[PDB]
Write a protein that binds this DNA or RNA. Structure first.
Ligand SMILES: Nc1ncnc2c1ncn2[C@@H]1O[C@H](COP(=O)(O)OP(=O)(O)OP(=O)(O)O)[C@@H](O)[C@H]1O
Ligand SMILES: Nc1ncnc2c1ncn2[C@@H]1O[C@H](COP(=O)(O)OP(=O)(O)OP(=O)(O)O)[C@@H](O)[C@H]1O
Ligand SMILES: [Mn+2]
Ligand SMILES: [Mn+2]
Ligand SMILES: [Mn+2]
Ligand SMILES: [Mn+2]
Ligand SMILES: [Zn+2]
Ligand SMILES: [Zn+2]
Lengths: 356, 348
DNA sequence: ATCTGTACATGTACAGAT
DNA sequence: ATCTGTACATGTACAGAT
DNA sequence: ATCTGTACATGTACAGAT
DNA sequence: ATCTGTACATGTACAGAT
């Protein structure tokens, strides 16, 4: 009940969806068209809509959209970066529009993102009917973020991605453990889909900085979010409703509200909660462990699980098991203890941050 | 217990499967080769394996195989023939054939018979034509008898015909998403060439959904993991095997049952699977109850003379027009007898 | 004349609105 | 409950190119 | 336009364990 | 008797090479 009313506050309004999507699609369509001009290295690039808005778990307002501009790259050869499992160098053994980004067979990610960025910036400059500008580059982002003032503020991340149709890198062999939940045929079919590489684009001063790419499974996450049940009819017009997505929304909202107040939580991001709930859905595969009538305890058990991840410094990437998103290397112990105490506080005082 | 030991004798043998498949594959591949590489009206025909063997519900022996040679055709007007639902005339390479099914099947048939004449490493002949069958049937012996149906099919990529709009009622079982996607696949047309002497029979085709039925057979649970290595086994397929066996044994013994076929059993269990969607209603521990409710369902179909095509709901496979009342009363008696006496026919 | 990248045309699951 | 906008998968038309 | 290579589904067969 | 784990077998989707 208390959580039904939060979900009501979190629910997007069709009026807002409608106006936000009309502008967002106008801009994206025009950027996609510019990428296909004859002399553009990005000709043939294709659009893939991803992220919470297209998974139907975007909360509060429709003000942040994510879209991949993906470019098929055949004859690709990968070299894992330092056994990290998620980061790779991308080699061409064959010698191509991607000429100008090569560095002796090694494909520079920052060179290709820069040219991509400049093209977008020019196309945005020629837009005169909507108030849209290109956000200052953020280190660690693979995105070119548009800031739209459809009066209200809207963010669109244009994510540059390489598309490889070969089999997935062996670092994922043990990843995606959906056999007991969505099953082996789903897993086999999912792993026949392409995998994606986006720029790491850190400026950490480490070797190979501007040539490191990072695996992306947004496409696979979108499928899972929209086909999330062990029963084929879960949340369908002739099936039973589950509360899997509602739990994701509540958890997203807890992290959003806290991050809004506390800059101690800057290392945390919504993908951490998304990852945590993929493990909980794997742990509790049956749709009856996500009955809408048990939203309270379903939310509670996800918090307990997240808390255990924080305290034990262990949140395995769902697709790359050997990659710990909560290792010391990425997030301070003190950053994790701070969030634990804040989560424990909300959990045991009626979630006062939901009332803000 | 009794039903387990029957399923054990119905189970195909891994060696028998290997020897028959490599010979069937030899013949089918050579036939397929001739239809395009040699420039004929069917250049571009593609192979689709169908039916009980490829659905893994073949019983007793790997002695019968069904293959579609499907051919893509665009802008084919589907005029439904006098509300039958399943039968259509086809209008607008294939210049030499209204697209007459009889004229196109006969050339198809002629090509296969020439190729079979040129096969010298396998004992294989072409069965004499059966009016009413869309198949070119091959008889192989190595030395075991194997029969292969080569089914000519037209492939259309448009919306399914309107007579199917209420068909395939899987929404509460496999769901709306599975259904929407299945109906995005092509649909197929195969020859009807009866000798009933009725009106437009020569130029008619019949809808085929063997591709959809294969998917269902192999994606038959309400849970995505049913019958997978990390899910629970159900007994849906074993019930189909048991009802197929009961009919096959009854048909061998009674000529009165010549108008029944295994596709009747297949259709009835599709309705049962829809009536009883939950995998737990097909637990292996309830094999007996499950088989019995299928029997009772099949008997109610006979009693009401009503067995709708799973994809074409206005097409009654049990209409008087197709099976006499007495044939259905006869079958009701034989099934009721086997049922009420522990199935003596299963022990022979 | 035919070919074909682009974009319209069709259908419906999802979920907000009433 | 029904009505209804967006997203998206796949079929098809055709201005402009060959 | 054709065909092999790959991965893992669907099966059968059976020893050891329960 | 069933369950489990390994071996053995064929069928099928599709990437990539020719
Ligand atoms: N650190 C990351 N590692 C891997 N994939 C990520 C990461 N951050 C984001 N992604 C991918 O990019 C998508 C979009 O990122 P974003 O941060 O917008 O979150 P979201 O899932 O869309 O949710 P929200 O924007 O509502 O907070 C994610 O859904 C995920 O697929
Ligand atoms: N009357 C029919 N109407 C529609 N489709 C049919 C009909 N008869 C057969 N088929 C299709 O053709 C396939 C081959 O039919 P066939 O008679 O060989 O039986 P089967 O299902 O393969 O089983 P079995 O041969 O083991 O008895 C069927 O599985 C079905 O898809
Ligand atoms: Mn987002
Ligand atoms: Mn984003
Ligand atoms: Mn058959
Ligand atoms: Mn047959
Ligand atoms: Zn659900
Ligand atoms: Zn099953």
């Amino acid at each position: 009940d208390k959580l039904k009313k939060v979900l009501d506050k979190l629910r997007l309004k069709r009026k807002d969806i409608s106006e936000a999507a009309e502008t967002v699609n106008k801009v994206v369509e025009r950027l996609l068209r510019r990428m296909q001009k004859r002399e553009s290295e990005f000709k043939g690039v294709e659009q893939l809509n991803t992220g919470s808005y297209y998974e139907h778990v975007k909360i509060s307002a429709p003000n942040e959209f994510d879209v991949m501009f993906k470019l098929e790259v055949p004859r690709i050869e990968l070299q894992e970066y330092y056994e990290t499992g998620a980061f790779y160098l991308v080699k061409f053994k064959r010698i191509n529009p991607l000429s100008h980004f090569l560095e002796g067979e090694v494909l520079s990610a920052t060179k290709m993102l820069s040219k991509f960025r400049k093209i977008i910036k020019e196309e945005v400059k020629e837009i005169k009917d909507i108030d849209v500008s290109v956000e200052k580059e953020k280190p660690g982002s693979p995105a070119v973020t548009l800031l739209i003032r459809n009066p209200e503020e809207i963010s669109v991340d244009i994510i540059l991605a390489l598309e490889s149709k070969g089999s997935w890198p062996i670092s994922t062999k043990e990843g995606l453990p959906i056999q007991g939940w969505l099953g082996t045929k789903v897993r086999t079919n999912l792993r026949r889909e392409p995998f994606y590489l986006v720029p790491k684009n850190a400026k950490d001063g480490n070797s190979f900085q501007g040539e490191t790419w990072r695996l992306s499974f947004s496409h696979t996450e979108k499928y899972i979010l929209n086909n999330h049940g062990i029963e084929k009819t879960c949340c369908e017009s002739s099936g039973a409703k589950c509360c899997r997505k509602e739990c994701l929304k509540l958890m997203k909202y807890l992290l959003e509200q806290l991050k809004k107040e506390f800059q101690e939580l800057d290392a945390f991001c919504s993908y951490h909660v998304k990852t945590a709930i993929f493990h909980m859905w794997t742990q509790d595969p049956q749709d009856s462990q996500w009955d809408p009538r048990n939203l309270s305890s379903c939310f509670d058990k996800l918090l307990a699980f997240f808390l255990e991840c924080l305290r034990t410094e262990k949140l395995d990437h769902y697709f790359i098991p050997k990659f710990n998103l909560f290792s010391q290397e990425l997030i301070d112990r003190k950053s994790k203890e701070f969030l634990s105490k804040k989560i424990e506080y909300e959990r045991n005082n009626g979630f006062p941050i939901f009332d803000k």
